[PDB]
């Protein structure tokens, strides 16, 4: 179920459905267009998580939480420079709050069932 | 070549960390206290907040005004 989270994120990068970040991640739960919520963890954020959690637990928005913040910024693909090799340093993204119009998926309906229980 | 007059200062942003913190208040349940208006335009709906003034409030996208 994260080579289904990479599919899902990157059926959400392509088609630009994802408002990425949390003044976006803040727009598209205020506008309510959370079909999922993405978070990574185990960062010195005292108010930041907590932010997220009640944004999350507000009505409807589902919680994936990873651990590492540089991990799930170097699958939302921002710094790859040589891609010959490996990424050289991607910031640490959070919130990539993904509105997937890219439904043409297998990895939609496997994250949903890993939701359903 | 050399002119009197000294040259103006350039614009720098002050940057602010964690922005959106400032925006809400996050509660002990699953709710809000958001202390700033949000903009009642067409143009920006429920997402875009208004600028909390010492005199005034203004949003920042569509330019909309209301003073005290």
Not at chain 1, 29 to 57: F, G, I, T, W
Not at chain 1, 76 to 91: A, F, Q
Request: glycine residues 6%; hydrophobic residues 35%.
């Amino acid at each position: 179920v994260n080579t289904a989270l990479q599919e899902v994120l990157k059926t959400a990068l392509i088609h630009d459905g994802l408002a990425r970040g949390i003044r976006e991640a803040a727009k598209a739960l205020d506008k309510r267009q959370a079909h999922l919520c993405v978070l990574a963890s185990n960062c010195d954020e005292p108010m930041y998580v907590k932010l997220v959690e009640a944004l999350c637990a507000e009505h409807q928005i589902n919680l994936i939480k990873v651990d590492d913040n540089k991990k799930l910024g170097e699958w939302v693909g921002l710094c790859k420079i040589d891609r010959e090799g490996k990424p050289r340093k991607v910031v640490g993204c959070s919130c990539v709050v993904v509105k997937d119009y890219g439904k043409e998926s297998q990895a939609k309906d496997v994250i949903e069932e890993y939701f359903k229980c | 070549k050399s002119y009197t007059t000294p040259k103006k200062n350039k614009h720098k942003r002050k940057k602010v960390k964690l922005a959106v913190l400032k925006y809400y208040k996050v509660d002990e349940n699953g709710k809000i206290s958001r202390l700033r208006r949000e903009c009642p335009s067409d143009e920006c709906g429920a997402g875009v907040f208004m600028a909390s003034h010492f005199d005034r409030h203004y949003c920042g996208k569509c330019c909309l005004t209301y003073c005290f």
